[PDB]
Amino acid sequence: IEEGKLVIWINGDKGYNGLAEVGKKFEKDTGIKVTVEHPDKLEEKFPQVAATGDGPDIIFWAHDRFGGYAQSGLLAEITPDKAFQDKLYPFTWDAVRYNGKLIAYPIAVEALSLIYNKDLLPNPPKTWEEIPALDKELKAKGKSALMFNLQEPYFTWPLIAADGGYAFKYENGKYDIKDVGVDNAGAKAGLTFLVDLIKNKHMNADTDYSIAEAAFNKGETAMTINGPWAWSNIDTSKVNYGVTVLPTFKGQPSKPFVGVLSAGINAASPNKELAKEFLENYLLTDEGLEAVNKDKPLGAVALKSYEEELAKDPRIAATMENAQKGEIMPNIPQMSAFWYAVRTAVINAASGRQTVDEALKDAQTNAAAEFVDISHKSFPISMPMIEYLERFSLKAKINNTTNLDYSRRFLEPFLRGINVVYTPPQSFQSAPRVYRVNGLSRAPASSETFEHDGKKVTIASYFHSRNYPLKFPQLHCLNVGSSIKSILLPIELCSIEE
Amino acid sequence: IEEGKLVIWINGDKGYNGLAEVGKKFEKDTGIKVTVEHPDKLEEKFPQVAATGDGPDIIFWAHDRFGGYAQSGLLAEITPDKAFQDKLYPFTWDAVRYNGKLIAYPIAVEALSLIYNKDLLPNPPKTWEEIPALDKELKAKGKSALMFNLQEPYFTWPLIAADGGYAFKYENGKYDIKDVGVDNAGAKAGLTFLVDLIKNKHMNADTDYSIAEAAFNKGETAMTINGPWAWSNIDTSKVNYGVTVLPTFKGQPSKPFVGVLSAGINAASPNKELAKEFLENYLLTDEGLEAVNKDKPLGAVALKSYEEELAKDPRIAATMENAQKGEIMPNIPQMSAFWYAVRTAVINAASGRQTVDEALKDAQTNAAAEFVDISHKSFPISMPMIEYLERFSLKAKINNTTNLDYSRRFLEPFLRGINVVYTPPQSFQSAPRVYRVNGLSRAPASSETFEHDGKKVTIASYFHSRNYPLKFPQLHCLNVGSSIKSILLPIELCSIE
Amino acid sequence: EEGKLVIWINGDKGYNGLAEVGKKFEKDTGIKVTVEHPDKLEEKFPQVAATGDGPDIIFWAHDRFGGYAQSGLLAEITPDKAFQDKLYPFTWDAVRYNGKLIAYPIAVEALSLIYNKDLLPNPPKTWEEIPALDKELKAKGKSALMFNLQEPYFTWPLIAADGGYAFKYENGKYDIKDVGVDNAGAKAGLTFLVDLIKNKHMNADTDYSIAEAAFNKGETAMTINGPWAWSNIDTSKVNYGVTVLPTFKGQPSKPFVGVLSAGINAASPNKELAKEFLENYLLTDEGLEAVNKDKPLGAVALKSYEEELAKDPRIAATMENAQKGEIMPNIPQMSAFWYAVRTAVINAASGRQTVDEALKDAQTNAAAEFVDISHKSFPISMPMIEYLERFSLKAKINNTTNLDYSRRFLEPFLRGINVVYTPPQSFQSAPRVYRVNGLSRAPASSETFEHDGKKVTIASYFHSRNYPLKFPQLHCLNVGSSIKSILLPIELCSIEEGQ
């Protein structure tokens, strides 16, 4: 359902106005209109819509999400040749490599750094431990020492990880999804320190990206923790800021998860060729990145040529300095589970509604959860009524010959009371419904007859006429009506719970 | 006991005709004749013959056996340089690394997968649990759902291991041979499920590789469990088959032990140089592997270059998919003990002659069983009468000076009634015999005398003359003389059972 | 200390060479550099440095500095990136403790097998073949092997070969609860050693000196030592070779690798000079060259100098052995570890204890818990203020607290109590034990007394002696008796608690 043009989705904190300038340059050369949008929770919506075969042509996000997207077969395999692949840093390509295939074009490396107000904190803390005292000082002047987004775990992880916490252990080549370190000792310490700052009114548990960005830019707080994209607004606010290494905890460096802004091609986009033309020959160029970067900094771009010149910028330098101390995020499907599990954890712990231990316990459990067998798009868990009967009653597989008369005896008591979800063929343009099952029909669908507009027709017959030949015409149907006032449903179109 | 040529041993289920084509290509270039053979139970015979200094020049088998071979010093340390070592996947070299040394050339990764008849089972089971019902269906059409070699534990391990069973636990670096998991809960579950299929006539306990291969290829059974090497015959049989992931058990994936077909150089081969020339420059090449692979699939070869192209094959893909879910076998010496212990176990449990618990109990014991003093060489375990006296009577070690007169008091009552096994020196060309000990001799063997053909000689003297100088001439002998007619036997040639 | 430079390095090292550097430094700065090599320095430094004494610079293997740093006896060195890039990063790691750099890396050390070519042209490849080899040599009036058995350092390689280890390195750090000196692999190794001694293939009482002397006299075919040792061997004109340590059970010997490091005394007043000497004099090609020429450092840390000496097969074998072993942890628990293993090896080797007995204790002692770094002495004491808060008042005391409100229960709580009164240092007096009879009648600022015909309060008096009491309003502890009292301000008292 995607047109013959280009639609791009990138996160709002990014430079979409810049990316769009590039789009205009593209249209002026090809006539192809490029539209850029920045939907809320896009990393969340893309998967949903793209599953339907909808969504944008290009999707921009940190590489960590694409693995799951690729897994859900929502991304197209990009095809850059060696000539192009050599224009970017190999470690960037690694980030976008999933199952040996390249699933997106690397744009830039991102990493949270400590941003501070020089006019207030000319000499910024070197450790988290000294922050409390620092707050006292500033509080006396009607200010606070630190403020950063506490709603997103991304910003809190650096501290949690500093002294030992981690997502999934990287063992001889890959990630062991059984080994999760968010419940370990190191992680608790970190999370605890945080919780204490909140506890001792040195920070607000409900502080979010917005609250914090606005406070720092108004010069009400001495420090904040953010990424490159954030500098623009600070420039605008005329605040005299500095960007440096994140403080240490228990002498350890804060390990921020490093991200690679990447752009993937919608598996369903019909404009894949255009997509790559725009990405390879427009965005991923010095003039291209320059335009986006000028709206909102990308940080350390992936294009060797452009990164090479912007490298002199100490802000990027500190970015990379922090990157050094942290580690690139895995791109495995388990990541969203991880993030989701940690989000709630930090939050609640921080709110006091849960203890660090309680929180990280669940966190551990959830981040370690296993993927409930796919194709079970339901909850409570559903199961085809055919499978149901086979596994719990007939104790045998059903097929185009099965005769349920032989089983009436026990089947009937087994179906009495049963609530089922009848869902008609899509072509019927109708909707799923719940029905209570009173019992088995008297006869097979191919024998069970009814009349309308003065004509006698069998259920099987009817279905065939509506282009939905029943898989098992010889099976008795489920009676959802009653004795003579029956409503017969073919078992193959029904399912249950548990 | 060998020659200035090349003799190779590979298992019969492998592509020996292909390996041989390579051998011909080698001869045409060197003149060196390469002969390939496939003896029964070769993994078993190699050790025996190679011990004698005999056997083939090259030996082909799954890496798991070479550790024990290397340990028995039956394998030569191969010497491939970095240039070559980079041509194969490092994890393969790991498989063939023992005690830091490389003991064989990796050929290909193998892993059992689920093979099925599409014409019968277009949509194969995803779990073992649904197999029973499936058999019922097929049985009605004069077919069965599954059939695979039950004689070899290799084929049954995937299930046994799925829910927790394992060989030896890998702890921080290596394998703890004290920790064996074939007796655990997970293992029992799996073995039990199997036993039940047999129990409910869904499978035959006596089904072997042959029975099963033939049934599937005749299209009498919907599924089978086998390795790459097996596809060839299926091709030939024109059966429309598919290869996919092994079903799950208790929701767990079947963990097949993964193997690396490797080729080791006989420690005694005098053609080691030729050996490696053939292996490095002929077999381990695209054209080389291609020839063997065309006879019978190697699966996922070790040579990066060739594996790279055959990778597109979904069969290999499923192979590796199953490999993913299982784990490479250890190569430690304890493996054969493991295999042997599990073989009997599965078998017997499957036959009903033993319960899963009984079976796995022994299995555990045997796999874990400690070795026994290399000194003892036969069976029954006999205790030398010297050792016997030391440990139960003298409470002291005996030597070339010991005088038993000092012990007469208690030794005598200790020896009365005692039955002993006297066994003469081999050179005597006689035979072991049981004798009843009446007591200690009057004097030491070197003093105890007797006469024959009119000559006086001491026992010690006599033995020396027959080239068997007694170890302890000064010891008194054991009197076996039933009556006042003494029969003195030197203690060192006696033992108790 | 003074306004100069005093350095301590171990005697087996090249102190005469280090000193040559010192002279070069004085000739340029006028600052006199003195180098000393005290016995058991790794042991004395901590003791003296605690007092605020000791040398300015301390040289030792990196493994000891963690504990030093922990005891706050070392200063944080401040080399900039320009300098930090002149040395190998893995060296800096060795000297990094709690994220901070606590010393300047000098060189990587690792024990290697040294042998007499004229006797053993083809040295053993395994420990197992050593016994037989001894027999051969013994017939010629020589022995196969001889090395320091007094120090565990030399024995660890074998003990560790087949599995023994200090502390397991788990996902980032060392688990001090997981100690592997009592495991199966360790016993095997220790046992093999004990047997060599048992079968008179080696003397349990053989030490570094005995062994160095025997090899250099050409009485033993092999020895196990470090780079520093080659010099004397050169001097002895013995034709030696340096190679990989033999294997045990097919395993390589895992020698603990050390990084010779130099730390700045936390108390040195010449820290600036210290680093100037270290960064611009010692850690230079000409610098290391001087020390190295006295006694080899092995594989230095300065990329530039190590780069040229790398051609030396001796260093090569050093590193080859280093490869097979592993860098020592630098955690505080190390000395406990070393001390525990020292006795263990020794005794087992002497037969006064079985490998199992020995390694049992070793294990126990090694994974020993460390009490808080704050408590510097024994018996452990607790300030009487803290004591009252935590066990009686169940509340924090401050400049307002009035103990009258608590008399009721405080009194019974203090009767019998023995306390350690310790006067301000300026008082030039000494700590004393007193038994507490009870609380004073009034606060220190109200409690009065008279001398030389003058009335003064306790609070008043203290202030006059330049020791203004922290809590003038608190009642004092009465150590006197019926009307004949001795009042002590609680803040100057403490208790050494029981059991």
Ligand SMILES: OC[C@H]1O[C@H](O[C@H]2[C@H](O)[C@@H](O)[C@@H](O)O[C@@H]2CO)[C@H](O)[C@@H](O)[C@@H]1O
């Ligand atoms: O908070 C978890 C969140 O972390 C990362 O998202 C970053 C994103 O990469 C940055 O570009 C920036 O926009 O902020 C985000 C956090 O607000 C992960 O990429 C994301 O999947 C995860 O949910």
Ligand SMILES: OC[C@H]1O[C@H](O[C@H]2[C@H](O)[C@@H](O)[C@@H](O)O[C@@H]2CO)[C@H](O)[C@@H](O)[C@@H]1O
């Ligand atoms: O059943 C125990 C047996 O398992 C493995 O043998 C496999 C071999 O690896 C495959 O290549 C193929 O030949 O079939 C064998 C089972 O029939 C072990 O490699 C072997 O040592 C072990 O005894």
Ligand SMILES: OC[C@H]1O[C@H](O[C@H]2[C@H](O)[C@@H](O)[C@@H](O)O[C@@H]2CO)[C@H](O)[C@@H](O)[C@@H]1O
């Ligand atoms: O033996 C225990 C001892 O080992 C290490 O000391 C080594 C030192 O590193 C070497 O350079 C050489 O001098 O010999 C010493 C052993 O005699 C540790 O550094 C030390 O702390 C430990 O006690």
Ligand code: NI
């Ligand atoms: Ni907006």
Ligand code: NI
């Ligand atoms: Ni928006």
Ligand code: NI
């Ligand atoms: Ni109608």
Ligand code: NI
């Ligand atoms: Ni045959």
Ligand code: NI
């Ligand atoms: Ni045969």
Ligand code: NI
């Ligand atoms: Ni005769």
Ligand code: NI
């Ligand atoms: Ni000295």
Ligand code: NI
């Ligand atoms: Ni001295």
Ligand code: NI
């Ligand atoms: Ni006076």
